[PDB]
Amino acid sequence: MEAVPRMPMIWLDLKEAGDFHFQPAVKKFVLKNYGENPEAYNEELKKLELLRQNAVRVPRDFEGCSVLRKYLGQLHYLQSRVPMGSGQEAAVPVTWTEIFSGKSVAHEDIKYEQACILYNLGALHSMLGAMDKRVSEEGMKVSCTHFQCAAGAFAYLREHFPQAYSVDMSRQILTLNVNLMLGQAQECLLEKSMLDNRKSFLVARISAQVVDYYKEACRALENPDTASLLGRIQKDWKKLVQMKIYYFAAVAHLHMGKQAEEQQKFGERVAYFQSALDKLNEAIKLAKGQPDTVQDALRFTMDVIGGKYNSAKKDNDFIYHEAVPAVKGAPLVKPLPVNPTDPAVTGPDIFAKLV
């Protein structure tokens, strides 16, 4: 199973930005409250304006993540010196497009700009995670890291910002995203654990945790209001996620059977391999119409599991004659921290001189 074709991954689209005309409000505030020439900070203001322009047209690459993190941090630095939050003196309209409806949503609140940038950091990480083939050591590692980073961004958004500036960033939707991203990180970890020839004991537990994350994502996708918001996207995601629940359950029980093989409990071995084959057959039914990438993974796994089940039953029936009978998850991935105000990720405070 170390050589199994890779399943495709889900990613999220980036949100589209509208206007955030901070410059005139900053100048008014500098003149009225800092008592200084309103044109004394034009270099700082142009540097921030250029950074926003870069962030809202971010390249879909690892450098783009750094741009979003830098801009997110500089918005925190600006807010610490000029009050542009809800109801505050220097607040100006912030407009972004809600991604599922295509409608513009405006709030006079710099933290809404921060929220959308952080969302896009999560979305970009999900894209980068889903782009690699996951066949190289560096590619498997970075894909896992990307999905952990995506989970961390959506979780930070959920916990540290006003709730539901727009419905694409509501707590329930962000929780779906976090679970999906952790499930995909755990799937990347499973692939690596099999290439590293970890103990069947551990591989089964890792795969069981993949199932656990995807089951929670599936539960969320079945919620009628989530299904309504995501529309046809919910149909697409649910088909892939529901198939993966059975696929990785089969992978877990395959490795439980291999543990029985190692412990010379050849009756248990047959029972786990039979359960694995039954779960994989359900995954194959659920994969009707899925792309060739999905079909290739399932066919490869059918060759492994079907052949192991057959040989295990033959060995039991004619050699060992053991009774055939009738898994706790290992969460080893976590959302990785955003650290929005660490100077190593933000660089120097653009407005350090405004004091």
Domain positions in the chain are 1-355
Cα 176–162–61 angle (5° rounding)? Answer: 55
The second-level CATH assignment, the architecture, of 1-355 is Alpha Horseshoe (1.25)
Instruction: Write down the experimental method used for this entry.
Output: X-ray
Q: Are strands 104-107 and 17-20 parallel, antiparallel or unpaired?
A: unpaired
In this structure, are residues 231 and 290 in contact, taking their beta carbons and an 8 Å threshold?
A: no
Short-list 173, 199, 205, 160, CA closest to 333: 205
From CA 352, how far away is CA 30, in angstroms rounded? 14
Query: In what order do the strands lie in the sheet containing 104-107?
Result: 17-20, 94-97, 104-107
From CA 17, how far away is CA 56, in angstroms rounded? 6
From CA 56, how far away is CA 101, in angstroms rounded? 19
In this structure, are residues 173 and 122 in contact, taking their beta carbons and an 8 Å threshold?
A: no
Angle of the 292-315 helix axis to the 232-262 helix axis, nearest 10: 30
The secondary structure of the chain, three-state, reads CCCCCCCCCCCCCCCCEEEECCHHHHHHHHHHHCCCCCCCCHHHHHHHHHHHHHHHCCCCCHHHHHHHHHHHHHHHHHHHHCCCCCCCCCCCCEEEECCCCCCEEEECCHHHHHHHHHHHHHHHHHHHHHHCCCCCHHHHHHHHHHHHHHHHHHHHHHHHCCCCCCHHHCHHHHHHHHHHHHHHHHHHHHHHHHHCCCCHHHHHHHHHHHHHHHHHHHHHHCCHHHHHHHCHHHHHHHHHHHHHHHHHHHHHHHHHHHHHHHCCCHHHHHHHHHHHHHHHHHHHHHCCCCCHHHHHHHHHHHHHHHHHHHHHHHHHHHHHCCCCCCCCCCCCCCCCCCCCCCHHHHCCCCCCCCC
